[PDB]
Amino acid sequence: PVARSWVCRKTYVTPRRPFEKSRLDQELKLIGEYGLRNKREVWRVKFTLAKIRKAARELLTLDEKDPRRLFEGNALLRRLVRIGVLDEGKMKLDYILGLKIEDFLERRLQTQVFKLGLAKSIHHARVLIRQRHIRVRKQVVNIPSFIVRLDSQKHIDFSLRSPYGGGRPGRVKRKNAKKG
Amino acid sequence: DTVTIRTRKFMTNRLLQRKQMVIDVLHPGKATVPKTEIREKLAKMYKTTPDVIFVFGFRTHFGGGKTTGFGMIYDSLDYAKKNEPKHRLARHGLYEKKKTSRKQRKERKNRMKKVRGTAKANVG
Amino acid sequence: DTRKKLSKAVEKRFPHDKLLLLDTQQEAGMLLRQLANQKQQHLAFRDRRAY
Amino acid sequence: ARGPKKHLKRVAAPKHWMLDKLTGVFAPRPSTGPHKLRECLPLIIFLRNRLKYALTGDEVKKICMQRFIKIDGKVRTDITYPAGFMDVISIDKTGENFRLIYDTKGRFAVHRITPEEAKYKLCKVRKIFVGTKGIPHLVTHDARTIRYPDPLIKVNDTIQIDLETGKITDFIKFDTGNLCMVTGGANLGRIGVITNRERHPGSFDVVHVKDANGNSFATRLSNIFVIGKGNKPWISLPRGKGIRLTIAEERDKRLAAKQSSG
RNA sequence: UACCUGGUUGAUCCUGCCAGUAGCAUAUGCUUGUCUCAAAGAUUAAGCCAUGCAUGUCUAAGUACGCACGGCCGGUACAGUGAAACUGCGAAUGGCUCAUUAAAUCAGUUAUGGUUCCUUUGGUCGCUCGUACUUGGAUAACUGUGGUAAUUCU
RNA sequence: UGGUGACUCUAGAUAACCUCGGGCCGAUCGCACGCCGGCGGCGACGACCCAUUCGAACGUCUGCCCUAUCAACUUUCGAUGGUAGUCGCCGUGCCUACCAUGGUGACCACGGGUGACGGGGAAUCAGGGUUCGAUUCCGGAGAGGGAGCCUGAGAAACGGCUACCACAUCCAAGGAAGGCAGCAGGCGCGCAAAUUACCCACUCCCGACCCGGGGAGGUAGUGACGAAAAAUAACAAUACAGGACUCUUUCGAGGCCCUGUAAUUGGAAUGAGUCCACUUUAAAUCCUUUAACGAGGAUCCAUUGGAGGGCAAGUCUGGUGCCAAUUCCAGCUCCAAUAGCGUAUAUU
RNA sequence: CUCUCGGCCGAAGCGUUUACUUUGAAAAAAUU
């Protein structure tokens, strides 16, 4: 007996057929578009989408006024809207079955740092977050895959402690400036 | 200066003769503020002496702006000497513990239970 | 962590071997005990011959 | 086992205690006493995990050993003493009084009461029997025996009893149209009015209760505690008045409170 | 995501098994920068074990003439701290393993109107018509003499 | 009297009994002292009985894998039932005496096997299923194998005792002591599994107890079992190469853009490391926070496998033998996943 | 679906008995 929990989950699925050209090319498309480190981030987002689709299908097998359908559909729709993947005017479960991996890829912190003009590229965005220059609200966030909510979209900025931000010069610049 | 103290979840615990709260410390570009400095800051905040103030369990957040810990102010030094743990009372120099290991005490105990009578006090 | 590196430095030639520490008399007794009770590698050449 | 078990694992503790998984291997293990193990709140869980006067069990012992805690008017120094339904906890140093009555979700409310309401308690009578020299005795739900009860008091009635004297002050019969709180099963904590009692000989009777909104629910007769006469309760009720809201209405009231306050 | 690729014929379709593939366990090889959690002598041998530790315990409230310490006030039995020892309680919990065990164990359901129960909590505790302003003998710790190679022996 | 669904229940009355190996009816201890020798307030400990609590133990109903190369079994020696008793905490062939001849079985008894402790549960998952569950929760069982007791409320107890069987320790040879399927650790076995560390601070348990103790438990150590996040570069100019758009029928021009590729230049940003201080904690460590140093081949250098018969991936090179074809060896190039990736075996 | 006694109803026999379906009570946590 120990005061430990052993509850833990794999968060991705390896595909059944390893070598098919269309899936490889589409994965490479997404990796290049979004600056992902490897195929496993594609598999991770694909997994969360598959989970959400299974939940929506099992809710849709229920009859229309079933209270579990109303409660759990409202919760699922509210969460998908809250991370900005579904529009607010599309609170219908069937629209969940229309989504794509690219939406949850657009809601990453890497992509939102790229689209807000703090970075010159998507790879510059991953590097910018990973090196403690990006802060959401007033919290330094180091994780590229941090999914940004709609109330947190207008609050992504530069760390008040970063050289590009508040302004203490970095290690290289302070080394070079003291040579002369 | 730039280190500010706020107290969040204040409670006047009249059963353990103290006031206990969560202490939130802001130090935007420094390290984690030492516990003694927080103790004079709480002594200035609550209009008292800092030898009855005990703070513990501070964790700095990721990013460095903020550190949360717990603190409690005792009415007197006597209630502090009664109701505080011995180790927190030792961190302030008010208690000194015995310098013997478990192996030494346990072997002494098992050795002196092979002896009957007041010769028990002669076993090392 | 010194010992950590040491184990790795050893593992290119001694792959699965325990690094005893010989600093004190108590550790010397532990090593002597480990040496007395341990399975013996038998070398065929000297075992077929009286030496 | 070769004799009584003395320990309680944390994951085997009662769920309504609301203990978390990673604090320890063990749960506080109530002592034997006036309430069952699965239907009690030990004093350490109340005074540490609910009221937060103490942060560890050691200073729970420090609060207890100063004789600041009373259950039903008596100083209880044991930190795992089993307190249960309708118990009146008095802490006169802080000047606070509590009654241990259930939430609508089946957990022991932190329910603060008036010092005037701390004087009495309601006990469900659990058996009546005649002892030597023809003396009627009454055994309640928390192991009280009262000599010479009123002859009108039968089993399953509720007696209002005075904590200082230990003598019966009043009683309520088990009738229809009469107010009860559920003390077990899936409907635990709900408060309503008895409408029916379908008797099953050699088996358990089932009592039908109607909520203040019109919701109807049944329980076993052992799960019924009469708490008022007709429609008005004889004690203070907690915030939720025994009306179990559905999860949709819980979500709606939570969002309405967020929108109104914030 | 209710998914495929190949293998017998000169060539075609079939049956039919297999190979690839994917997951889960054990092991193992090569490699390994950071950080969070985290299983871990079950499988074979319920095989065999050196050494150490794993179970003890005192409040104002059972027994203090150990100066082992320690103030009175002096006829005041006993200030107070208190090792030892007697007495009481615990050692039937916890921890380990899976050998046994196949309507046995075990789960759900019921019963004790067929039983016991330390303890906690409540009741009962002048309900008996018949030296007490206090009863008796011991035995430890302690002092002293010892036996045996050897024991938590005496 | 009172109760139950049902008492031979509870309570009542009478005649008595009441075990010396004996049933209650207080020769106990502390703290404050006060009233009219007598009256006393809080407690502590004991205690017959009844209730309660924690159980425990016997029963009820339903539910388990493989085997007929196990078809009849139990019954003298209790197998099924009856009466009376014994014993037990109690109901009962539990045991005894005498009777009755019963009881179970192809709806699979009885016997044997299981790489069988049982459940909660795990993997797969359209669904039905198939496979797994020694293992932290619940229930059982055992302490080398059997057997029998003592104390106690509770044990057929093994960190209790007494024997025998198998092992084994010390000895002055007369004697004495034993039981890691507890925590470490060792030997053996094997394909196969960590430190003879620190602490009662946490969780809780026990005791006369706020105070002592706890290899339970917590903490570090070993740990690529497994699961989570996640570095190994980014940008600008320059030079070529594409692709758009303006002007030209086109060639062409675009200080017109955009996108790639560099034995090309450039300083900006930083961790990995090294190392003060806090913080952490029982004391530490780690993490988190922060000084200082810390990057150009940023040598601070990513591996593991597979490809020239099909899923992803070759019209390649050099040695070596055999009669241009052709056994063995070392490479290049490409593809896949990536701090991970092959293999064996089992299983789905 | 009814026959009696007590306040249009409550008790009683149920109506051949089942298999089936539904409801209600009750049914550890952890895991999912």
Query: Cα–Cα distances in Å, from B48 out to A60, B12, B44?
Result: 64, 15, 7
Of B13, B82, B85, the CB nearest to D53: B13
Distance CA C22, CA C29 (A): 9
**Most A-contacting residue of B61, B62, B66 (CB-CB within 10 A), to test interface:** B62
The three-state secondary structure class of D234 is coil
Distance CA A17, CA A14 (A): 9
Centroid of chain to Cα D198: 25
* Cβ-proximal residues to A109 (8 Å cutoff; 6+ apart), any chain: A129, A134, A136, A141, A143, A144, A145, A146, A147, A148, A156
In a domain, A101, yes or no: yes
In a domain, A5, yes or no: no
In a domain, A35, yes or no: yes
- Is strand G in 7 Å reach of the CB of A38? no
Q: Which residue, D107, D105, D91, is CA-closest to D47?
A: D91
CB B57 within 8 A of CB B70: yes
List chain D residues with CB under 8 Å of B85: 58
In a domain, A12, yes or no: no
Q: Which residue, A132, A140, A113, is CA-closest to A34?
A: A113
Tell how strand B18-26 and strand B11-13 pair up. antiparallel
Distance CA D32, CA D45 (A): 16
Q: Which residue, D62, D21, D59, D28, is CA-closest to D43?
A: D28
Chain B residues at the A interface, defined by Cβ less than 8 Å, are 28-29, 61-65
Distance CA A142, CA A133 (A): 9
Sign for the pseudo-dihedral over CA of A55, A58, A64, A69:
negative
Distance CA D187, CA D184 (A): 7
Please give the domain boundaries of chain B with CATH numbers for all domains: 4-121 (3.30.70.3370)
What's the gap in Å between the CA of D22 and the closest CA on chain A?
5
Distance CA A78, CA A96 (A): 12
Count the Cβ atoms, other than its own, within 10 Å of residue A95.
15
Distance CA A107, CA A84 (A): 7
In a domain, A172, yes or no: yes
The DSSP element (H or E) to which D228 belongs, if any, is strand D228-229
Distance CA D46, CA C25 (A): 55
D78-100: string of b/e by CB count within 10 Å (b at 16+)? bbbbbbbbbbbbbbeeeeebbbb
CB B27 within 8 A of CB B3: yes
List chain A residues with CB under 8 Å of B65: 138
Taking only residues 16 to 75 of chain B, the set having a beta carbon closer than 8 angstroms to any beta carbon of chain D reads 16, 70
Q: How many domains does chain A have?
A: 1
Subunit contact A161:B64, Cβ cutoff 8 A? yes
Q: Which residues pair with A162 in a beta bridge?
A: none
Query: Cα–Cα distances in Å, from A84 out to A88, A99, A105?
Result: 8, 12, 11
Q: Which residue, B6, B40, B32, is CA-closest to B21?
A: B6
Distance CA D40, CA D82 (A): 5
- Kindly write down the DSSP assignment for every residue of B38-107, as one continuous string: HHHHHHHHTTS-TTSEEEEEEEEPTTSSEEEEEEEEESSHHHHHHHS-HHHHHHTTS-------HHHHHH
Distance CA D46, CA D24 (A): 17
CB A170 within 8 A of CB A163: yes
Distance CA D224, CA A86 (A): 49
Angle at A47 between CA A46 and CA A53, to 5 degrees: 90
Bases of strand F lying below 7 A from some protein CB: 1-5, 10-12, 50-56, 136-140, 152-158, 186-189, 195-206, 210-211, 213-219, 222-223, 226-236, 267-271, 274, 277-283, 288-291, 293-295, 311-313, 336-339
Helix axes A39-60, A67-82, angle to 10 degrees: 150
In a domain, A57, yes or no: yes
By C-alpha distance, the chain D residue nearest B16 is D63
Structure tokens at A122: 């998507």
The DSSP element (H or E) to which D192 belongs, if any, is strand D191-198
Structure tokens at A37: 């480190």
Distance CA D195, CA D144 (A): 29
Structural domain of residue A113, as residue ranges? 18-180
Structure tokens at A137: 């609200």
List chain D domain ranges. Answer: 1-116, 121-171, 174-244
Centroid of chain to Cα D46: 13
Distance CA D4, CA D2 (A): 7
